[PDB]
Amino acid sequence: HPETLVKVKDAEDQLGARVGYIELDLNSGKILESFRPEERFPMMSTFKVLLCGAVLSRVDAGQEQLGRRIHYSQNDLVEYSPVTEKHLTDGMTVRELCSAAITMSDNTAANLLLTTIGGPKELTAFLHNMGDHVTRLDRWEPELNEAIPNDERDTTMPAAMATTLRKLLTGELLTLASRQQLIDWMEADKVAGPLLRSALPAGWFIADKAGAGERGSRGIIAALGPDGKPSRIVVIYTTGSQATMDERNRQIAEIGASLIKHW
């Protein structure tokens, strides 16, 4: 609805930064509403959905096992590692690492799973192969959150990310039990409370993944819908604001509030 676009421009005014926004019909793939749909924004932790997508495609190709245990040491630990720092003695299975990377945005879990896959270049080749010629992962955690102005490394466009997410969740690229597993992880997200979830009505479904980075970067990708079923993808990104984490959170939740009010 255009009143949501009013709120997105208002958030650019409040945050003093660019907000990229898109709302996409899950079924038809119709773009319902957009703002800066084709400008690049840093992905930050929203790439972790795409990573566990590449991992699950390998698992469906018989190339990886979800029960496989990865043993890492204190030397692999980078900043923001809530879960992995606690399982240093015994390791973690691929399943647990994708659950930690999505549910808790654990950074070492993401780096560990990236090594599995063959690194940023191989996630980027996987994206290229599914029709996404825009999104690219270049660096590892934590360097990919740097968000240098105009740097194309580690960036997506709201429209490319929205379309890639729709394919991952409804296309024939992943097995249905794999699509469901990816959706389950996103729905168990523990660390996005003040963003769209704070605006969601009771009974609605949300599966999402947020991220933050340097230079005011904040964003979220989400499949949400009434009556416990998703029917829209929403992608929101910002970068460049000098506002507090709390002000960037508030603005994204108010954009959620109007998109929900005008559903």
Report domain extents, the chain: 1-263
**Structural contact between residues 43 and 252, judged by C-beta atoms closer than 8 angstroms:** no
Nearest CA among 82, 142, 135 for reference residue 114: 142
The distance of Cα 62 from the centroid of its chain, to the nearest Å, equals: 25
The residue to which tokens 């959150």 are assigned = 145
Rounded to whole angstroms, the Cα distance separating 133 from 182 reads 22
Name the maximum alpha-carbon separation found in the chain: 53
Question: What's the distance, Cα to Cα, between the start and end of the chain in Å?
Answer: 8
The residue to which tokens 């390791």 are assigned = 91
The distance of Cα 191 from the centroid of its chain, to the nearest Å, equals: 12
Tokens at residue 105, please?
Answer: 């945005």
What is the number of other CB atoms lying within 10 angstroms of the CB of residue 82? 16
Q: What is the dihedral of CA 221, 47, 158, 150, to 10 degrees?
A: 140
DSSP state string for 92-118: EEHHHHHHHHHHS--HHHHHHHHHHHT
Burial of 203 (0-12, 13-18, 19+ CB in 10 A): exposed
Q: Which helix (H) or strand (E) holds 12?
A: helix 2-15
Can you say whether residue 60 is alpha, beta or left, with left for phi > 0 and alpha for psi between -120 and 50 degrees?
alpha
**Catalytic site residues?**
45, 143
The one-letter code for the residue type at 35 is F
What three-state secondary structure class fits 25?
A: strand
Can you say whether residue 227 is alpha, beta or left, with left for phi > 0 and alpha for psi between -120 and 50 degrees?
left
Strand 205-212 relative to strand 218-225, pairing: antiparallel
CA atoms within 13 A on the CB side of 231: 8
Tokens at residue 15, please?
Answer: 């945050």
The phi, psi pair for 39, rounded to 5°, reads -100, 160
**Residues 6 or more apart from 115 whose CB is under 8 A from it?**
none
Spell 216-243 as b/e; 16+ CB within 10 A means b: bbbbbbbbbbeeeebebbbbbbbbebeb
Q: For 1-263, CATH number?
A: 3.40.710.10
Rounded to whole angstroms, the Cα distance separating 214 from 220 reads 15
Rounded to whole angstroms, the Cα distance separating 217 from 248 reads 9
**Structural contact between residues 206 and 226, judged by C-beta atoms closer than 8 angstroms:** no
**Structural contact between residues 204 and 223, judged by C-beta atoms closer than 8 angstroms:** no
What is the number of other CB atoms lying within 10 angstroms of the CB of residue 77? 15
Tokens at residue 132, please?
Answer: 């996404």
The residue to which tokens 């690194």 are assigned = 119
For 115, 131, 134, 135, the CA distances from 128, given in Å and listed in that order, are 19, 6, 8, 8
Local structure of residue 47 (DSSP, 8 states):
H
For 7, 20, 33, the CA distances from 259, given in Å and listed in that order, are 9, 14, 10
Q: What angle is formed at CA 233 by the lines to CA 232 and CA 238, rounded to 5 degrees?
A: 140
